[PDB]
């Protein structure tokens, strides 16, 4: 039973790239069900993509590393 | 793509060039491929192609495992 619970914590953890794939299957669904274009679309998966490449960038990430260390950074 | 079943019964029947059929299993990447190219179809859920992959390799490791048994008796 420890077995089967670490290997099901391990897989329900996931990892960024399928909380992304996830986050980027019910959007391609939302611009199925309502029936958009063909460059608009590639304009809003172009954006989900720039963002999450760009959401580790953040402040926020490190929000417990001290000052002068922070600073120097910046 | 050897045929090595001519082989076998040309070189005086030895067991160990019956072996290299093995080699054929390596016929599995189109069957992976095909995974891979169904986990990227966003009609179906990623993790119920997770799921039916596990299945597929559930199955043929227990048709592998009695060929295997059943050569081990011979």
Request: charged residues 25%; hydrophobic residues 45%; aromatic residues 14%.
């Amino acid at each position: 039973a420890y077995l089967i619970g670490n290997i099901t914590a391990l897989i329900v953890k996931g990892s960024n790239t399928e909380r992304f794939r996830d986050k980027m299957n019910d959007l391609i669904s939302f611009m199925n069900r309502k029936k958009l274009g063909r460059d608009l679309r590639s304009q809003i998966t172009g954006h989900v993509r720039l963002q999450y490449d760009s959401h580790y960038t953040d402040t926020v990430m490190l929000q417990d590393i001290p000052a002068s260390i922070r600073a120097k950074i910046a | 793509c050897f045929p090595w079943d001519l082989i076998y019964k040309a070189s005086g029947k030895h067991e160990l060039v019956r072996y290299l059929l093995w080699i054929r299993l390596f016929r599995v990447r189109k069957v992976v491929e095909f995974f891979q190219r169904l986990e990227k179809d966003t009609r179906i859920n990623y993790l119920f192609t997770r799921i039916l992959k596990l299945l597929f390799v559930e199955v043929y490791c227990t048709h592998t495992a009695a060929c295997i048994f059943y050569y081990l008796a011979t």
